[PDB]
Amino acid sequence: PLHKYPVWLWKRLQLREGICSRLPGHYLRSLEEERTPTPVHYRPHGAKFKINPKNGQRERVEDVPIPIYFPPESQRGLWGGEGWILGQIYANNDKLSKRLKKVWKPQLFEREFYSEILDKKFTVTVTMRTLDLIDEAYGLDFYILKTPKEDLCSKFGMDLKRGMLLRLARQDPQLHPEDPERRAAIYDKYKEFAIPEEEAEWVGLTLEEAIEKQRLLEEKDPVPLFKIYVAELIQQLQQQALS
Amino acid sequence: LTYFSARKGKRKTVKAVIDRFLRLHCGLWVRRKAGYKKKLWKKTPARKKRLREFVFCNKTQSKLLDKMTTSFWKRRNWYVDDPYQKYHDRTNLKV
Amino acid sequence: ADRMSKWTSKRGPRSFRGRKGRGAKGIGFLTSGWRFVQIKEMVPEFVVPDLTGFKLKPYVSYLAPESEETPLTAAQLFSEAVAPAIEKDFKDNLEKYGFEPTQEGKLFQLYPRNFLR
Amino acid sequence: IGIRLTLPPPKVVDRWNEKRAMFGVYDNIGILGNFEKHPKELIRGPIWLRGWKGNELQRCIRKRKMVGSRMFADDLHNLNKRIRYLYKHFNRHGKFR
Amino acid sequence: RGHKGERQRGTRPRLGFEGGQTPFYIRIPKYGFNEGHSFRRQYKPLSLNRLQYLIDLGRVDPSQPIDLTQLVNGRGVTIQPLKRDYGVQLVEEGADTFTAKVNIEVQLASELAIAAIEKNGGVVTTAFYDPRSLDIVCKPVPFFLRGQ
Amino acid sequence: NFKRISYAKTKTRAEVRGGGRKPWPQKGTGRARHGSIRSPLWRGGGVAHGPRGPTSYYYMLPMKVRALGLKVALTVKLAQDDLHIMDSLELPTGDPQYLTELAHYRRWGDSVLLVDLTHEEMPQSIVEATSRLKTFNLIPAVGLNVHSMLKHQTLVLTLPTVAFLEDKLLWQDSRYRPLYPFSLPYSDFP
Amino acid sequence: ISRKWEKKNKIVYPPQLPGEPRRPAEIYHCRRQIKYSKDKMWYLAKLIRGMSIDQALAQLEFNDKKGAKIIKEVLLEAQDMAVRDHNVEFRSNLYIAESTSGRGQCLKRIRYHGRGRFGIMEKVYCHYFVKLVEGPPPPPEPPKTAVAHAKEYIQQLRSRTIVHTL
Amino acid sequence: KKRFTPPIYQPKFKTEKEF
RNA sequence: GCUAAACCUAGCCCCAAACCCCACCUUACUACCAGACAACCUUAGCCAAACCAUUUACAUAAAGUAUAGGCGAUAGAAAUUGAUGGCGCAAUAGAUAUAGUACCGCAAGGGAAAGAUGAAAAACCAAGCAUAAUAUAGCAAGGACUAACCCCUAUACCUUCUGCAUAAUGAAUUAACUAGAAAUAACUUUGCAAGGAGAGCCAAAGCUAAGACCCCCGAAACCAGACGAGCUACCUAAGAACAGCUAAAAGAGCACACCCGUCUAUGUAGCAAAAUAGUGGGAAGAUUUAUAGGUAGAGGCGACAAACCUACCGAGCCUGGUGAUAGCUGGUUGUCCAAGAUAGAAUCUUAGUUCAACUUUAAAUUUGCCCACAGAACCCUCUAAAUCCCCUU
RNA sequence: ACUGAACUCCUCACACCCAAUUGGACCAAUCUAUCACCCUAUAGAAGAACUAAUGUUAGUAUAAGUAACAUGAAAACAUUCU
RNA sequence: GCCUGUUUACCAAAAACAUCACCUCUAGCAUCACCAGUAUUAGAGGCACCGCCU
RNA sequence: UCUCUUACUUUUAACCAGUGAAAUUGACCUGCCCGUGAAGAGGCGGGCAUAACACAGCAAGACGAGAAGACCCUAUGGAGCUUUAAUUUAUUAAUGCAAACACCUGCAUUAAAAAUUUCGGUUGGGGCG
Ligand SMILES: Nc1nc2c(ncn2[C@@H]2O[C@H](COP(=O)(O)OP(=O)(O)OP(=O)(O)O)[C@@H](O)[C@H]2O)c(=O)[nH]1
Ligand SMILES: [Mg+2]
Ligand SMILES: [Mg+2]
Ligand SMILES: [Mg+2]
Ligand SMILES: [Mg+2]
Ligand SMILES: [Mg+2]
Ligand SMILES: [Mg+2]
Ligand SMILES: [Mg+2]
Ligand SMILES: [Mg+2]
Ligand SMILES: [Mg+2]
Ligand SMILES: [Mg+2]
Ligand SMILES: [Mg+2]
Ligand SMILES: [Mg+2]
Ligand SMILES: [Mg+2]
Ligand SMILES: [Mg+2]
Ligand SMILES: [Mg+2]
Ligand SMILES: [Mg+2]
Ligand SMILES: [Mg+2]
Ligand SMILES: [Mg+2]
Ligand SMILES: [Mg+2]
Ligand SMILES: [Mg+2]
Ligand SMILES: [Mg+2]
Ligand SMILES: [Mg+2]
Ligand SMILES: [Mg+2]
Ligand SMILES: [Mg+2]
Ligand SMILES: [Mg+2]
Ligand SMILES: [Mg+2]
Ligand SMILES: [Mg+2]
Ligand SMILES: [Mg+2]
Ligand SMILES: [Mg+2]
Ligand SMILES: [Mg+2]
Ligand SMILES: [Mg+2]
Ligand SMILES: [Mg+2]
Ligand SMILES: [Mg+2]
Ligand SMILES: [Mg+2]
Ligand SMILES: [Mg+2]
Ligand SMILES: [Mg+2]
Ligand SMILES: [Mg+2]
Ligand SMILES: [Mg+2]
Ligand SMILES: [Mg+2]
Ligand SMILES: [Mg+2]
Ligand SMILES: [Mg+2]
Ligand SMILES: [Mg+2]
Ligand SMILES: [Mg+2]
Ligand SMILES: [Mg+2]
Ligand SMILES: [Mg+2]
Ligand SMILES: [Mg+2]
Secondary structure, X not given: OEXXXXXXXXXXXXXXXXXXXXXXXXXXXXXXXXXXOOOOOOOOOOOOEEEEOXXXXXXXXXXXXXXXXXXXXXXXXXXXXXXXXXXXXXXXXXXXXXXXXXXXXXXXXXXXXXXXXXXXXXXEEEEHHHHHHHHHHOOHHHHHHHOOHHHHOOHHHHHHXXXXXXXXXXXXXXXXXXXXXXXXXXXXXXXXXXXXXXXXXXXXXXXXXXHHHHHHHHOOOOOOHHHHHHXXXXXXXXXXXXX | OOXXXXXXXXXXXXXXXXXXOEEOOOOOEEEEOXXXXXXXXXXXXXXXXXXXXXXXXXXXXXXXXXXXXXXXXXXXXXXXXXXXXXXHOOOOOOO | OOOOOOOOOOOOOHHHHHHOOOOOXXXXXXXXXXXXXXXXHHOOOOOOOOOOOOOOOOOOOOOOOOOOOOOOOHHHHHHHHOHHHHHHHHHOXXXXXXXXXXXXXXXXXXXXXXXXX | OOOOOOOOOOOOOOOOOHHHHOOOOOOOOOOOOXXXXXXXXXXXXXXXXXXXXXXXXXXXXHHHHHHHHHEOHHHHHHHHHHHHHHHHXXXXXXXXX | OOOOHHHHHOOOOOOXXXXXXXXXXXXXXXXXXXXXHHHOOEEEEEEHHHHHHHHHHOOOOXXXXXXXXXXXXXXXXXXXXXXXXXXXXXXXXXXXXXXXXXXXEEOEOOHHHHHHHHHOXXXXXXXXXXXXXXXXXXOHHHHHHHOO | OOOOEEOOOOOOOOXXXXXXXXXXXXXXXXXXXXXXXXXXXXXXXXXXXXOOOOEEOOOOOOHHHHHHHHHHHHHHHHHOOOEEEEOOOOOOOOOHHHHHHHHHHOOOOOOEEEEEOOOOOOOHHHHHHHHOOOOEEEEEHHHOOHHHHHHOOEEEXXXXXXXXXXXXXXXXXXXXXXXXXXXXXXXXXX | OOOHXXXXXXXXOOOOOOOOOOOOXXXXXXXXXXXXXXXXXXXXXXXXXXXXXXXXXXXXXXXXXXXXXXXXXXXXXXXXXXXXXXXXXXXXXXXXXXXEEEEOOOEEEEXXXXXXXXXXXXXXXXXXXXXXXXXXXXXXXXXXXXXXXXXXXXXXHHOOOOOXXX | OOOOOOXXXXXXXXXXXXX
């Protein structure tokens, strides 16, 4: 027979049914949205149309992203959308020659970064692209807050984003205690990224982590039916006495 | 050739034919003589003139090219200024 | 080579045959020298009542009225046990009426059940 | 001995049941109804061959294209293999070439 | 099916294969006969004979400005914009016996066709139509149903 | 045929369960060479050339051809004295016995195809009379078809149905070649 | 399977007219699914064909084949039922008009051979059938004498015609 | 080389059938 | 008259619609003790290119178009357009399924067969034989005959082949099953007609629709992922065995158990898918062996014999790609009639194919064959049968 | 002189003897639409026809009642003996 | 062929493989083999006891 | 062992009783000689012979059964192995240049190791020529 729904919609159906259904709306929308990552390993075309030299006609041109493999070690570091390129090459760059499997790996450096919002020194395996992006963003905190998930491409990066956003939302006095002026200066500097604490809590959570968080939120020991029956009987007797 | 394509189920055209032969709507296929650009220094003027000419094809060659090209290539084309416009139809042809 | 037959302690070498049991619940532990220390508290003590004078024979007389089945419910138990006292003291601290906040501290805890049968 | 020794049970066919009696009605829905509905819209059956016809390879290609995502795993594997085999047969085997 | 060989086995080589000899369709040099065919503009011919026939049968009304929409509606010409047709070209055929006075707008026109139209008191103008406008003008009702 | 969709399918040797391993080696066994126990030769094997998938027999005759077929059917009925025109299909009563007796008295055929202009306005009397009958079938004007006209011995038409059929079938004569489907708006087509 | 031989005992003939020869009694008996080869049973059957019941019993009593005992039991049962049910006056006035053996339902077993190969054994079973007819056994067909044989030859000579002519 | 074809055993039920 | 024969429904196929008490990860199905170890990583190959090496597919329309491509086999868009059951099976069929059971394999895994009464059971026909063995002589029949045989005539069939009774292949026989799928262009028949078509497409009588049109089994192989060191190769842990005699701390001698297998005989569907009897080598050592563990196939292990790795290892087994491919062999199933044997060229090509020639069908037209003179070379001194051409007939 | 073909004649009737291939006329059975109603007709369809593949499954033959297989002896069936 | 031993389980048990002995080459070193070792050691090999010559 | 074989015992064997396979098998009403022929006849031509049957031996023939010959050739069919066969270095080891302030990454070069694939045709069979 035939399935009622296409197999590619089964994950979305599971999202719509169950504890995933009880997950907050903003988190579900963040999971759904699939904005394309910034080009890293391919040069994007300048425009949507190009005059092809062969026949001198205007043809639509599309940017097909190069598949990127992110090894698990990447999720413990900050690679600026950079990963392993697992592909193939033609030996001597001629298609009439042998085809060979080629893996291009990024150059990883161990560096230390200071987070003003977190007030903590983090040692991170980083790429030169990530360093350049940090310089462009004018700091690790700015880079973390500005970069979306699809470009940050790091569970550690998203956890840092969640921590920074949570501290911004709560205006935590734990940021530089006994220095309220400095704390206020930092919070004002990173004000524009402040969001509600409710959203900041779920920012950057995987689906499994969100499921666990929701379960831990809604886990309640069953109320004894003694209390429910007592309340109902008290209410009924109150009605009898009143009327 | 591909009689039924795997994506559309249609008959495919052999582009090698399109790159070498011209079909006249009457059913005639025009071609250039092989070697017309080869070793012209050793070829005589008459041979060069023979090789520089556009040549028709046999009945069997025409049938083969028709089989190797799809119907789109056999349509009636009203190009703006076609150098072969007058040759698309036969005149005073008996049988 | 026999896969469809149940795995029992009768099958296998000496070690297998000794190690596997038949479902009997443990009664104690093993100390040095393979000496079995039997713990009395782990031995199920059958609390058999005194049947002397009991008037309920195993079978019921066929000349007995038939009554509708009424599976006891939590609401029914509350009505028959707690509701009278609740009404009396409402006309005139749920622990006094009977509610126990936590099963802990009891010999027979209802959940997780810690008693046999 | 491949022949039965008894007459088969009589087969009675109701030539005037509802289906036979009303068969063919609305086949001219288009020409007789201002062409609001095409007669092919009266065809009830598999989604991938409603008002469409083709050989086995074309039918398999259309089935995979239209309902392939909703097919069962082994059925879809069988359909892919059938498409592969039919491609090879129709494009590489036959008397005429 | 024959006897053994590839023919009976149903495994004879592809069409165009010549047993290993360089095929006919490959030993002929490549020439740009059909280079840019999909980019060459095509204009359907509209002979003055056809125009007179349509006018005489009333399928094209000469009392109103005649253009591509009116020709298509009268079924005097069949335009296929998807097949790189860019419109209609007037053709001198039938010029001698053309007598209708008409205001016809086409895409291309021959000198003799223009001369005939103007001699019969009519007016002729050549108007360009890019593929999208050409499709819309040839089939206006579908465009109006598109809602754009 | 055009509505026909045969749902007959057989498993080919690739789809029959199992049959992956070679039953026995090529040589030395003294038995016939085989590559799988599910080849068409084997018991329980596949079907070499069987019905494959749900197959459609859909094909469309030209609408002019189908309209001409309707016209020819009507002419055949009239010439063979099976066509009966009516002012209206209103019956004195809804009793099927009355309709059957009327047909028998008028010497109609064993089967009568009654036609009315539109489904909605069909008289309640005739609706009730024909709902219980098997060989008397009531259809709207839009439902007329050659197969039913031939299956039913006599064809009963009303005057508005006659006008409807005349207009619809005659339009095909003297209609243009379509520019686009007639469902879309035209200058003069309803 | 077929069991017509048993049914053959249930046919009832119409009463005979007074001026009609007395119909000899016919008794059909059989034993089914005997653990014996029908080929071996056939020899015993053929041996007892056409003989009186007593002679057949005497011959079988002193035969070493296993089937002999079974056939003797079947013949004794046939005699008993002929006397009790088929109104046969004398036990000894019966002769074996028909005696045959038929194939029974056989079971298939495996015989193991020397190199992982095998054969298909057949646990053979056979049926046995007898028809007993009342009256003395019919006399054996006498060997044809020289006189009769020469008479046949002369008849053949006289039967000659002028072939392929008017 | 040495050419050996292993014996093929028939299914047991065929010869284990009973009345 | 025995074996037997049949049977109708158990169910299944394709669609539509619709989204779907206790025990058990240790040796699973085992009540009850200090954990830490936790997952992402391009498919490949067969095959096609007649080799193979780059390469080779995984609603309609635009369109098989733009493009890609040892520019070759082939691959191939987008803009834009608008989107209620059965001429199914009915127990060798239909799911493998009465069942993933029985059975087979260490394991992965492979994988069956079948039943038929009746409202109530609390009622003639396949093969093979038997009835009934056989008579001189012969493809077992035919012509016949008064007559079965005797008389005369007659070299089974299929495939393959130049040619088969061939002592070339296949076939014991019965029942059942078992093998020609389709486009382009043509042909026939309709509809309409300078237009046809239910958008797109075609059109210098076209166009729409229909009819007709291309098989089955078989490798050795290749790749991917699993399963295998209970056999065997080697190794690890901790064990066990080795009488007696001679000699003396021995890779010592004779010789039991034990291990092996030199030679002979038997056996060769065997007792045995490697055995038996005798004979023989070692038998305190580099020995033999029980137990548990380890090394896994682009591999392991190897006192190298290309040994052994679960009976078939020049590289295991199972599953999948896979209906691999095969120019090679075999097979390719109703009746009847008709036409039908014929130069060569190219080809990694001579076991094949394309073109030609021949052959078939349908159609248009007018010359086709036979052939009278006349005519077609000297080199060369002479020189064949003949040939070409060719009106008439 | 005679005998002597499927040559020829004779009386009647004529499509009724070439492999591969090709053209054509019929057609068994099945289902479907209408007929028919002791077996059919006109059409539409198709898993549409088996003397042959060391073909698959099942039955039964041939080899063949053959090759092979088995129980130490007596007895009271207690027991004894070899 | 030095020897005792090993080998193609299922056609070859041998002159073949190994073998003490001798010879060539590589390696200056530790926490999973080599190795819990360190040039008189370890590994990769050739040939084959010893003895005489070259 | 043999000249040179013989005698006996057991098994086997033959007969009786029980149980009861396998390969094979186109159909067989299954003779000899000569000749013929697809080049060696039970079946064809000319002769000869000829009641029907079991049972036990034999191995001259049925080009006997068995394994779709291992020899040989062919296939643009495989696979194993070797290479100074073609194409590569994807993998390792070195270096050199970048990048970073030895390691890792990118790019080149050199080796080891391998990997994929092929190994034309005519031919008085094939090879050599
Ligand atoms: N094509 C098709 N129609 C089906 C199938 N099952 C049911 N139907 C149709 O479903 C309709 C209703 O089925 P019924 O059983 O009569 O009624 P129902 O139980 O309400 O139906 P459902 O809602 O479909 O379960 C009828 O027209 C059936 O023919 C099926 O498998 N295929
Ligand atoms: Mg053949
Ligand atoms: Mg050939
Ligand atoms: Mg070549
Ligand atoms: Mg398979
Ligand atoms: Mg295969
Ligand atoms: Mg099946
Ligand atoms: Mg038998
Ligand atoms: Mg290839
Ligand atoms: Mg091929
Ligand atoms: Mg698109
Ligand atoms: Mg079945
Ligand atoms: Mg019979
Ligand atoms: Mg033969
Ligand atoms: Mg042969
Ligand atoms: Mg044979
Ligand atoms: Mg072991
Ligand atoms: Mg000792
Ligand atoms: Mg020793
Ligand atoms: Mg060696
Ligand atoms: Mg060797
Ligand atoms: Mg093995
Ligand atoms: Mg094949
Ligand atoms: Mg003929
Ligand atoms: Mg004569
Ligand atoms: Mg068939
Ligand atoms: Mg048959
Ligand atoms: Mg067969
Ligand atoms: Mg027998
Ligand atoms: Mg014998
Ligand atoms: Mg014997
Ligand atoms: Mg030695
Ligand atoms: Mg030794
Ligand atoms: Mg060893
Ligand atoms: Mg050996
Ligand atoms: Mg050994
Ligand atoms: Mg040996
Ligand atoms: Mg040596
Ligand atoms: Mg016997
Ligand atoms: Mg001879
Ligand atoms: Mg004999
Ligand atoms: Mg012998
Ligand atoms: Mg013979
Ligand atoms: Mg032989
Ligand atoms: Mg062979
Ligand atoms: Mg060889
Ligand atoms: Mg090859």
